[PDB]
């Protein structure tokens, strides 16, 4: 069976128990802590690629009043998140399963920008989700898994200094 675990849930956890947020600029700002996934029970000998995209969690704009974040009242249907793919994609099954699959590289904007970079809507709370896509073989297949544990709020500046002082403990 394949198996989709998160790499350092331990800290994604911290994170997540203050409201986790993630830094967006026009330029993209790379993630921390950064997504790394532990992946068992592919066939070595296949070959995969590794897509990464952000779920709108909820369809709110979110803001942060008196030190706590709270939803506005105004939902929008949320439009689905481009797709990143992993830099090591194309790939052998072997690859992927010798090491933690780290998405170092993804950088999270909120401008439409030349390409790469994620664009997500400011103030709107997001969950990461992976899709591990079997290629080149005769049968496309798709797995998809989320990590609950790796939700954040987009933000151009941390509203939380809580979270400010956990990204500098553990950069
Ligand atoms: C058919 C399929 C499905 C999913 C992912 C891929 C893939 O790994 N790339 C990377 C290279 C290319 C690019 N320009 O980034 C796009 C296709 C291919």
């Given at each position: 069976?394949?198996?989709?675990?998160?790499?350092?849930?331990?800290?994604?956890?911290?994170?997540?128990?203050?409201?986790?947020?993630?830094?967006?600029?026009?330029?993209?700002?790379?993630?921390?802590?950064?997504?790394?996934?532990?992946?068992?029970?592919?066939?070595?000998?296949?070959?995969?690629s590794f897509?990464?995209?952000?779920?709108?969690?909820?369809?709110?704009?979110?803001?942060?009043?008196?030190?706590?974040?709270?939803?506005?009242?105004?939902?929008?249907?949320?439009?689905?998140?481009?797709?990143?793919?992993h830099?090591?994609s194309?790939?052998?099954?072997?690859?992927?399963?010798?090491?933690?699959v780290?998405?170092?590289?993804?950088?999270?904007?909120?401008?439409?920008?030349?390409?790469?970079?994620?664009?997500?809507?400011?103030?709107?709370?997001?969950?990461?989700?992976?899709?591990?896509?079997?290629?080149?073989?005769?049968?496309?297949?798709?797995?998809?898994?989320?990590?609950?544990?790796?939700?954040?709020?987009?933000?151009?500046?941390?509203?939380?200094?809580?979270?400010?002082?956990?990204?500098?403990?553990?950069?």
């Open positions: 069976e394949l198996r989709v675990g998160l790499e350092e849930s331990e800290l994604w956890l911290r994170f997540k128990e203050l409201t986790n947020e993630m830094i967006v600029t026009k330029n993209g700002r790379r993630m921390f802590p950064v997504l790394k996934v532990n992946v068992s029970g592919l066939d070595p000998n296949a070959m995969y897509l990464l995209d952000f779920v709108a969690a909820d369809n709110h704009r979110w803001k942060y009043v008196n030190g706590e974040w709270v939803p506005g009242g105004k939902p929008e249907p949320q439009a689905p998140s481009c797709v990143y793919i830099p090591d194309p790939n052998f099954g072997a690859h992927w399963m010798k090491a933690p780290s998405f170092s590289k993804v950088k999270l904007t909120n401008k439409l920008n030349g390409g790469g970079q994620i664009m997500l809507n400011s103030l709107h709370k997001y969950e990461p989700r992976i899709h591990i896509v079997r290629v080149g073989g005769p049968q496309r297949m798709i797995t998809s898994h989320c990590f609950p544990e790796t939700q954040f709020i987009a933000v151009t500046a941390y509203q939380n200094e809580e979270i400010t002082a956990l990204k500098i403990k553990y950069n």
